[PDB]
Amino acid sequence: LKRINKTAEDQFLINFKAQNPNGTWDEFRNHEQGILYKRLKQHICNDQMYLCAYCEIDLDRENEHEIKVEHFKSKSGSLPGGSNWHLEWSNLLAVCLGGTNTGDDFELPANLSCDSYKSHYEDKNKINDKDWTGKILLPLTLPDAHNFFTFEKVTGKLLPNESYCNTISIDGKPAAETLSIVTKTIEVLNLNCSRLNNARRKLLFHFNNCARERNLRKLHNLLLQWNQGEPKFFQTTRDIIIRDDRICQGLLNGTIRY
Amino acid sequence: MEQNLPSRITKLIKKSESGDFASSYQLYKVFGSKEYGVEPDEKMSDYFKELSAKQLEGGQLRVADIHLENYKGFESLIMDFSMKKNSTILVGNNGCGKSTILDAIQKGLTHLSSRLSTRSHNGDGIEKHELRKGQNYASIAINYDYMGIRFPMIIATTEPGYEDRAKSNYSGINELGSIFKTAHSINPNVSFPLIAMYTVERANDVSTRDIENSEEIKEAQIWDKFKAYNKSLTGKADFKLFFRWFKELIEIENYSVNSKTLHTVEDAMYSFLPGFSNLKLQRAPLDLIVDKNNVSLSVLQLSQGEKTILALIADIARRLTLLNPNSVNPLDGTGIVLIDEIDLHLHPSWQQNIIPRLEKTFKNIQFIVTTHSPQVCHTIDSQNIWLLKNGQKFKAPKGVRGAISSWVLENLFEVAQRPPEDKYTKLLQEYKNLVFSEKYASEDARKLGATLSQHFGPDDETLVELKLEIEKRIWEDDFEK
Amino acid sequence: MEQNLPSRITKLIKKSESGDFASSYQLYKVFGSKEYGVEPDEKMSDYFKELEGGQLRVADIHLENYKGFESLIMDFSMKKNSTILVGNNGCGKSTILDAIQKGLTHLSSRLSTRSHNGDGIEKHELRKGQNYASIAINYDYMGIRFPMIIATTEPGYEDRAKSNYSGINELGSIFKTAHSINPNVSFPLIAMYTVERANDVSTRDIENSEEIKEAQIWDKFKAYNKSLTGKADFKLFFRWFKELIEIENSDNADITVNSKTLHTVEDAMYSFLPGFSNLKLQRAPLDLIVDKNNVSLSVLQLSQGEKTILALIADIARRLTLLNPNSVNPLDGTGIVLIDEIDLHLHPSWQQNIIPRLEKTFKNIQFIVTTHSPQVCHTIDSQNIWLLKNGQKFKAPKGVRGAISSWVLENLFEVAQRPPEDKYTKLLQEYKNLVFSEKYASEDARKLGATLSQHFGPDDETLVELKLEIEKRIWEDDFEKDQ
Ligand SMILES: Nc1ncnc2c1ncn2[C@@H]1O[C@H](COP(=O)(O)OP(=O)(O)OP(=O)(O)O)[C@@H](O)[C@H]1O
Ligand SMILES: Nc1ncnc2c1ncn2[C@@H]1O[C@H](COP(=O)(O)OP(=O)(O)OP(=O)(O)O)[C@@H](O)[C@H]1O
Ligand SMILES: [Zn+2]
């Protein structure tokens, strides 16, 4: 889920909170119209480089209607006088549509992923306490170089790991049981669904077609395109593929050079 | 002011005075009685109903929603059809229930047909065999849409010996029948809503074997508008009366009706059937003649798919021409045509064009249909494909229109793209495991790779990808040593 | 030469020391003037002329001016028992099957009770134009060819075609002689099932009490009573079920064996239908009750697919049960069972298992099924799939036994993977041509990409390749031109 860094507020989410202590998200959307909502979406997406926090896919840069904003701690869990979990600018994330367009509540659970299957899980197993912080990975406070995810090249699934899961701790939990946190993070959002396991398996196709030529220069060009900056879609899986190839790893650290 | 409030009445009646049909119907819903703040005045309400009778020009009788409780395998399922896309397709597994909804809609229309025809009898209720085992009541609540006013209808049956709870309030079908009867009264040349139903038994009617002996030619069938609904809400269609119709029209051809209706009906199957032209009758042995690519064949040995697609569109066109009076475009009227099992005796090159051809030929017709072949499915948007499963409705995944057959299978029909237990696909899975498991070329991957290469050839897509993987990994063993 | 034929003395010794059926069968003709008319003595053809495990299998066929075909030759396989003829709806697929029907009716006739006939080429079944028509069929029982030809002349041109119904009379004689030695001898399962299999099961036809009222006696030739018309006689199956259950009730009332056939027939049906168990007869107003997952339903309310499968399998199981008395495995026998449109009223999942399950439960049975659905085609080898296109035979490409439905659909059916007039496939092609060109990142390209991504989503497999290649081109072009 990468590691997204937020910069600062722009004194326009401050004024709305100042004029209205309690939080109702639909009130913010149905404000003086699109202006504030447009600019909040823009400023949120630019911090994420126009990518989704949960499932790394390319959000359209010229069509808002394909861009949605998801509250990490669900907006159904706000408590009067307890918290303001609708407008704090540390719970806002930019997410895709998740396999649905109108939210009819009659779409297949297996297809739904990224963000909507979070709500589906909450309804299905009746998660009363919407305090996901601690059980599902937060794409705002993770380590910047995570060895969490192993790319199973057979089916394209993202699977837990033994190493690096008993070393680092998240949300103050004991570091000896982060494996359960990662497994539930996979389960709640279904990063391992059909429409993403059959989309991450084609980056492997690209990486292996850029190696048919048996030319190390083309592989060099591929590495400097996939590991330069301005993250593109599915950047995490890109990094896993580069890290699982010993020729590539050797190229980036001396031995085996052109 | 006539002592009545002139504000809301004038707000909602200006379009009615202009000619809008919905506003007059809305007025004659509360003006006559006392249900809204309007006084119980019966002058303007009756004038409005009489005027609204003569305001229907272009509309569409369409089923909007259906609500079933304990009807046939369904505990509760509330459909919501489309008022913009004129095609709804139901998809699912045989056993979940699709003919249940089709039969419910047919039962609903069995009373509307009687209400619109000259008769006034009732249709059919819920039979004893159409109640769930260990259950006491059932309901077939259905609503309809004319030019824009909702019209309800409930057909419910309860066992007297257990409980008496449900009712049967037909209601709006009587009002619709009143509108159409008054429309006929003012002018007999007025279009009527078609109603049709086509079960899996359409095939068992097409035969010109002793028409004189069998039926429907030894009579004096008067060709009118009200009685065109004969056997319309049943299974097998009407081909013998079809042949009677050709006989009469061609023989009278020898004014304008012969040149118009016969030509249009011919063009229907001329467009649907690619290569069947120059229809004509046979007089001595009393059969039909078709010219398939300039060779003449009767209707007793044509292809079964051609037979079915002939009878289907032929019946639809015949009833549309009978229900409609003198008009330039007589196949563009209105109706609710239910066609169970559209993918019946058809080739995968016609299943991808059956629906667009139906919509381009008959424009303003609703086509609630059930299918079981993906090629039919991915010709229509996902918003109009229901995936009835385990007694509850799930809508089709996003982006079905213009998709591929394998994806439609996997993500909508719950069927694996490759065969599930074919020995070669299991060998393919074992090969795919061995390639990615850091154990290639250990005398057990090469034999299996050769075995799969001998069957699919060296050109199968997936095998080429595994070959790319093994080639790249054998590259790795070079520079690391 | 002669006197044991020193040229073939060893061959004659081999036939003498038969110890089998093939080596003791042709000896009848060998001692009955095989080479040329000589030595017609019946003593030689008494111990070398006068059967456990066989396969009455159609081997080939030849059609001349019958229906749309003008000349066509098939050769059905012998080791593997399946044939899945596929073709365009209109060119022809029922002509072959109806030809085998006209051929097999005479066999079923001449082995049922007596040698007679009843099917010949009709006038409407004649090629428009061409006068002479012939339907040649040749069987194979334990590796012996039995020819058979039918003929008909339109303007009395009794010169170009004749009907030599020979050899099949010999086959009928062999079967009848086998019956004479022992009545308990197995017979084939000549049967056909047209596109109207299940248009006989009805709730009123479950009630009955007014349709079949007679004293039908079950014999071996009962299976040949209306077995080639194109219907599954579910009513007679229901009668047989009622008789079996009532005799079981009589037996266990006298109690206060002979029922294993009922268990076998029910087990044949329970395998194909999933979760359907506890089949029982209702003596209360006459019905049949089927239990589906602890829910007791009736035949009247089963869906179309279950009705069709139940009718077909019940008919086949009943016929083989009658035809194979006192058999530890009654449902093996042999047959040339023909089925038309085995992909009718079936779910895509059920279609993927319809052929292997039939071939497993009924192993020694031939099927010449015809299919329109690609899902059925990718379960059997390509050497057994025969494509009928433009009145000729073309063999299917290799690699069909397991394959993606798209490949079979676009190679054996000549149908595009995507709709060819849909306004979201033309846009796909118009965008893909732009992507694989020098006008990438053009404004129209961006508009089309956005339009396609809004519909198919941003993770469709086709879209991912296009966006990756756009990234490739933008990286390569900008980096090189700046340098
Ligand atoms: N009264 C009932 N009692 C028990 N089971 C029932 C009852 N009514 C319906 N069912 C179950 O629900 C199923 C409904 O079958 P149905 O014919 O509606 O399937 P369908 O796929 O929608 O129709 P079709 O095959 O023609 O497309 C039955 O097969 C049966 O299993
Ligand atoms: N006497 C004839 N003259 C001309 N064409 C004929 C004649 N008899 C049959 N045909 C041809 O036979 C074709 C249709 O016959 P057929 O029933 O075999 O096709 P089919 O749809 O594949 O059958 P099925 O789907 O039931 O297996 C027509 O194209 C028709 O031209
Ligand atoms: Zn997403």
Side-chain angles (χ1 to χ4, degrees), chain A residues 52-57 59 94-99 113-115 195-196, chain C residues 458-459:
Chain A
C52 295
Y54 280 135
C55 82
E56 311 82 355
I57 62 170
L59 285 200
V95 298
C96 84
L97 294 174
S113 57
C114 191
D115 46 355
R195 65 182 294 276
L196 282 71
Chain C
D459 291 331

PDB file of all heavy atoms in Angstrom, chain A residues 52-57 59 94-99 113-115 195-196, chain C residues 458-459, ligand 3:
ATOM      1  N   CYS A  52      -4.052   5.519  -6.191  1.00  0.00           N
ATOM      2  CA  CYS A  52      -4.903   5.075  -5.099  1.00  0.00           C
ATOM      3  C   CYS A  52      -4.067   4.589  -3.925  1.00  0.00           C
ATOM      4  O   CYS A  52      -3.044   3.921  -4.103  1.00  0.00           O
ATOM      5  CB  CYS A  52      -5.834   3.962  -5.564  1.00  0.00           C
ATOM      6  SG  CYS A  52      -7.007   4.482  -6.804  1.00  0.00           S
ATOM      7  N   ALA A  53      -4.511   4.934  -2.717  1.00  0.00           N
ATOM      8  CA  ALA A  53      -3.784   4.531  -1.520  1.00  0.00           C
ATOM      9  C   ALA A  53      -3.869   3.029  -1.298  1.00  0.00           C
ATOM     10  O   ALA A  53      -2.887   2.400  -0.888  1.00  0.00           O
ATOM     11  CB  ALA A  53      -4.324   5.281  -0.304  1.00  0.00           C
ATOM     12  N   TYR A  54      -5.030   2.434  -1.561  1.00  0.00           N
ATOM     13  CA  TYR A  54      -5.274   1.047  -1.182  1.00  0.00           C
ATOM     14  C   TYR A  54      -4.777   0.077  -2.250  1.00  0.00           C
ATOM     15  O   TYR A  54      -3.911  -0.763  -1.983  1.00  0.00           O
ATOM     16  CB  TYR A  54      -6.767   0.841  -0.913  1.00  0.00           C
ATOM     17  CG  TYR A  54      -7.208   1.322   0.451  1.00  0.00           C
ATOM     18  CD1 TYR A  54      -8.371   2.065   0.602  1.00  0.00           C
ATOM     19  CD2 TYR A  54      -6.462   1.039   1.584  1.00  0.00           C
ATOM     20  CE1 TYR A  54      -8.778   2.509   1.843  1.00  0.00           C
ATOM     21  CE2 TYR A  54      -6.862   1.474   2.828  1.00  0.00           C
ATOM     22  CZ  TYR A  54      -8.020   2.210   2.953  1.00  0.00           C
ATOM     23  OH  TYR A  54      -8.421   2.649   4.194  1.00  0.00           O
ATOM     24  N   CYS A  55      -5.316   0.184  -3.462  1.00  0.00           N
ATOM     25  CA  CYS A  55      -4.901  -0.636  -4.596  1.00  0.00           C
ATOM     26  C   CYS A  55      -4.291   0.288  -5.644  1.00  0.00           C
ATOM     27  O   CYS A  55      -4.982   1.137  -6.215  1.00  0.00           O
ATOM     28  CB  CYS A  55      -6.080  -1.455  -5.132  1.00  0.00           C
ATOM     29  SG  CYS A  55      -7.243  -0.650  -6.270  1.00  0.00           S
ATOM     30  N   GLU A  56      -2.992   0.143  -5.880  1.00  0.00           N
ATOM     31  CA  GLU A  56      -2.243   1.117  -6.672  1.00  0.00           C
ATOM     32  C   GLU A  56      -2.642   0.997  -8.137  1.00  0.00           C
ATOM     33  O   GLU A  56      -2.143   0.135  -8.862  1.00  0.00           O
ATOM     34  CB  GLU A  56      -0.744   0.912  -6.493  1.00  0.00           C
ATOM     35  CG  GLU A  56      -0.274   0.805  -5.046  1.00  0.00           C
ATOM     36  CD  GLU A  56      -0.463  -0.581  -4.458  1.00  0.00           C
ATOM     37  OE1 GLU A  56      -1.046  -1.448  -5.141  1.00  0.00           O
ATOM     38  OE2 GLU A  56      -0.026  -0.803  -3.309  1.00  0.00           O
ATOM     39  N   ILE A  57      -3.549   1.873  -8.577  1.00  0.00           N
ATOM     40  CA  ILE A  57      -3.978   1.936  -9.967  1.00  0.00           C
ATOM     41  C   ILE A  57      -4.043   3.398 -10.385  1.00  0.00           C
ATOM     42  O   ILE A  57      -4.066   4.307  -9.553  1.00  0.00           O
ATOM     43  CB  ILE A  57      -5.338   1.248 -10.199  1.00  0.00           C
ATOM     44  CG1 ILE A  57      -6.434   1.945  -9.399  1.00  0.00           C
ATOM     45  CG2 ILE A  57      -5.267  -0.218  -9.810  1.00  0.00           C
ATOM     46  CD1 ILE A  57      -7.817   1.473  -9.754  1.00  0.00           C
ATOM     47  N   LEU A  59      -5.441   6.604 -11.313  1.00  0.00           N
ATOM     48  CA  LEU A  59      -6.603   7.480 -11.328  1.00  0.00           C
ATOM     49  C   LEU A  59      -6.525   8.442 -12.503  1.00  0.00           C
ATOM     50  O   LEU A  59      -5.458   8.971 -12.825  1.00  0.00           O
ATOM     51  CB  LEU A  59      -6.700   8.257 -10.017  1.00  0.00           C
ATOM     52  CG  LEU A  59      -7.187   7.444  -8.823  1.00  0.00           C
ATOM     53  CD1 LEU A  59      -7.716   8.361  -7.740  1.00  0.00           C
ATOM     54  CD2 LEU A  59      -8.280   6.498  -9.285  1.00  0.00           C
ATOM     55  N   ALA A  94      -7.307   9.080  -1.059  1.00  0.00           N
ATOM     56  CA  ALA A  94      -7.847   9.074  -2.412  1.00  0.00           C
ATOM     57  C   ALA A  94      -7.904   7.636  -2.910  1.00  0.00           C
ATOM     58  O   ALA A  94      -6.882   6.944  -2.938  1.00  0.00           O
ATOM     59  CB  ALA A  94      -7.001   9.937  -3.345  1.00  0.00           C
ATOM     60  N   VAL A  95      -9.098   7.189  -3.301  1.00  0.00           N
ATOM     61  CA  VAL A  95      -9.328   5.804  -3.683  1.00  0.00           C
ATOM     62  C   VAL A  95     -10.068   5.756  -5.011  1.00  0.00           C
ATOM     63  O   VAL A  95     -10.644   6.745  -5.471  1.00  0.00           O
ATOM     64  CB  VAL A  95     -10.119   5.028  -2.612  1.00  0.00           C
ATOM     65  CG1 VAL A  95      -9.340   4.974  -1.311  1.00  0.00           C
ATOM     66  CG2 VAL A  95     -11.478   5.670  -2.403  1.00  0.00           C
ATOM     67  N   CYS A  96     -10.044   4.577  -5.622  1.00  0.00           N
ATOM     68  CA  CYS A  96     -10.692   4.339  -6.904  1.00  0.00           C
ATOM     69  C   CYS A  96     -12.184   4.090  -6.698  1.00  0.00           C
ATOM     70  O   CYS A  96     -12.744   4.341  -5.628  1.00  0.00           O
ATOM     71  CB  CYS A  96     -10.022   3.174  -7.622  1.00  0.00           C
ATOM     72  SG  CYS A  96     -10.619   1.546  -7.137  1.00  0.00           S
ATOM     73  N   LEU A  97     -12.853   3.608  -7.747  1.00  0.00           N
ATOM     74  CA  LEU A  97     -14.263   3.258  -7.635  1.00  0.00           C
ATOM     75  C   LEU A  97     -14.461   1.884  -7.009  1.00  0.00           C
ATOM     76  O   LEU A  97     -15.506   1.630  -6.402  1.00  0.00           O
ATOM     77  CB  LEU A  97     -14.923   3.319  -9.010  1.00  0.00           C
ATOM     78  CG  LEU A  97     -14.990   4.714  -9.632  1.00  0.00           C
ATOM     79  CD1 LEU A  97     -15.532   4.646 -11.051  1.00  0.00           C
ATOM     80  CD2 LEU A  97     -15.834   5.641  -8.776  1.00  0.00           C
ATOM     81  N   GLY A  98     -13.481   0.994  -7.143  1.00  0.00           N
ATOM     82  CA  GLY A  98     -13.553  -0.300  -6.495  1.00  0.00           C
ATOM     83  C   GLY A  98     -14.433  -1.319  -7.177  1.00  0.00           C
ATOM     84  O   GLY A  98     -14.936  -2.232  -6.514  1.00  0.00           O
ATOM     85  N   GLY A  99     -14.633  -1.198  -8.485  1.00  0.00           N
ATOM     86  CA  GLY A  99     -15.474  -2.126  -9.211  1.00  0.00           C
ATOM     87  C   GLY A  99     -16.949  -1.800  -9.215  1.00  0.00           C
ATOM     88  O   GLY A  99     -17.744  -2.616  -9.697  1.00  0.00           O
ATOM     89  N   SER A 113     -13.438  -4.474  -4.551  1.00  0.00           N
ATOM     90  CA  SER A 113     -12.161  -4.495  -3.851  1.00  0.00           C
ATOM     91  C   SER A 113     -11.741  -3.057  -3.572  1.00  0.00           C
ATOM     92  O   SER A 113     -12.521  -2.117  -3.763  1.00  0.00           O
ATOM     93  CB  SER A 113     -11.107  -5.254  -4.664  1.00  0.00           C
ATOM     94  OG  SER A 113     -10.946  -4.680  -5.949  1.00  0.00           O
ATOM     95  N   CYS A 114     -10.505  -2.894  -3.097  1.00  0.00           N
ATOM     96  CA  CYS A 114      -9.880  -1.595  -2.868  1.00  0.00           C
ATOM     97  C   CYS A 114     -10.568  -0.813  -1.755  1.00  0.00           C
ATOM     98  O   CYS A 114      -9.978  -0.606  -0.691  1.00  0.00           O
ATOM     99  CB  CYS A 114      -9.850  -0.772  -4.159  1.00  0.00           C
ATOM    100  SG  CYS A 114      -8.831   0.720  -4.068  1.00  0.00           S
ATOM    101  N   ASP A 115     -11.790  -0.359  -1.982  1.00  0.00           N
ATOM    102  CA  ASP A 115     -12.457   0.431  -0.950  1.00  0.00           C
ATOM    103  C   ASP A 115     -13.848  -0.072  -0.599  1.00  0.00           C
ATOM    104  O   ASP A 115     -14.231  -0.026   0.572  1.00  0.00           O
ATOM    105  CB  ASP A 115     -12.560   1.893  -1.392  1.00  0.00           C
ATOM    106  CG  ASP A 115     -13.037   2.032  -2.819  1.00  0.00           C
ATOM    107  OD1 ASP A 115     -13.202   0.996  -3.496  1.00  0.00           O
ATOM    108  OD2 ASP A 115     -13.266   3.175  -3.259  1.00  0.00           O
ATOM    109  N   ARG A 195      -9.554  -9.155 -10.636  1.00  0.00           N
ATOM    110  CA  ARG A 195      -9.258  -8.014 -11.494  1.00  0.00           C
ATOM    111  C   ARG A 195      -7.937  -7.332 -11.159  1.00  0.00           C
ATOM    112  O   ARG A 195      -7.482  -6.496 -11.946  1.00  0.00           O
ATOM    113  CB  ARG A 195     -10.410  -7.009 -11.428  1.00  0.00           C
ATOM    114  CG  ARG A 195     -10.608  -6.365 -10.070  1.00  0.00           C
ATOM    115  CD  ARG A 195     -11.792  -5.412 -10.071  1.00  0.00           C
ATOM    116  NE  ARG A 195     -11.584  -4.249 -10.924  1.00  0.00           N
ATOM    117  CZ  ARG A 195     -10.949  -3.148 -10.547  1.00  0.00           C
ATOM    118  NH1 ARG A 195     -10.437  -3.026  -9.335  1.00  0.00           N
ATOM    119  NH2 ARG A 195     -10.830  -2.140 -11.408  1.00  0.00           N
ATOM    120  N   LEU A 196      -7.311  -7.658 -10.027  1.00  0.00           N
ATOM    121  CA  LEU A 196      -5.964  -7.189  -9.724  1.00  0.00           C
ATOM    122  C   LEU A 196      -4.897  -8.267  -9.824  1.00  0.00           C
ATOM    123  O   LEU A 196      -3.760  -7.954 -10.185  1.00  0.00           O
ATOM    124  CB  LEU A 196      -5.899  -6.559  -8.327  1.00  0.00           C
ATOM    125  CG  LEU A 196      -6.432  -5.137  -8.109  1.00  0.00           C
ATOM    126  CD1 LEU A 196      -7.939  -5.047  -8.179  1.00  0.00           C
ATOM    127  CD2 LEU A 196      -5.937  -4.619  -6.774  1.00  0.00           C
TER     128      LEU A 196
ATOM    129  N   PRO C 458     -10.010   0.662 -15.019  1.00  0.00           N
ATOM    130  CA  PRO C 458      -8.575   0.902 -15.203  1.00  0.00           C
ATOM    131  C   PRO C 458      -7.679  -0.306 -14.966  1.00  0.00           C
ATOM    132  O   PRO C 458      -6.457  -0.138 -14.937  1.00  0.00           O
ATOM    133  CB  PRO C 458      -8.314   1.985 -14.152  1.00  0.00           C
ATOM    134  CG  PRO C 458      -9.232   1.584 -13.004  1.00  0.00           C
ATOM    135  CD  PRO C 458     -10.367   0.744 -13.594  1.00  0.00           C
ATOM    136  N   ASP C 459      -8.241  -1.505 -14.800  1.00  0.00           N
ATOM    137  CA  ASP C 459      -7.443  -2.708 -14.604  1.00  0.00           C
ATOM    138  C   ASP C 459      -7.762  -3.804 -15.612  1.00  0.00           C
ATOM    139  O   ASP C 459      -7.377  -4.958 -15.392  1.00  0.00           O
ATOM    140  CB  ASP C 459      -7.622  -3.250 -13.184  1.00  0.00           C
ATOM    141  CG  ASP C 459      -7.007  -2.347 -12.141  1.00  0.00           C
ATOM    142  OD1 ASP C 459      -6.021  -1.658 -12.475  1.00  0.00           O
ATOM    143  OD2 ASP C 459      -7.507  -2.324 -10.996  1.00  0.00           O
TER     144      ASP C 459
HETATM  145 ZN    ZN D   3      -8.506   1.273  -6.275  1.00  0.00          ZN
END
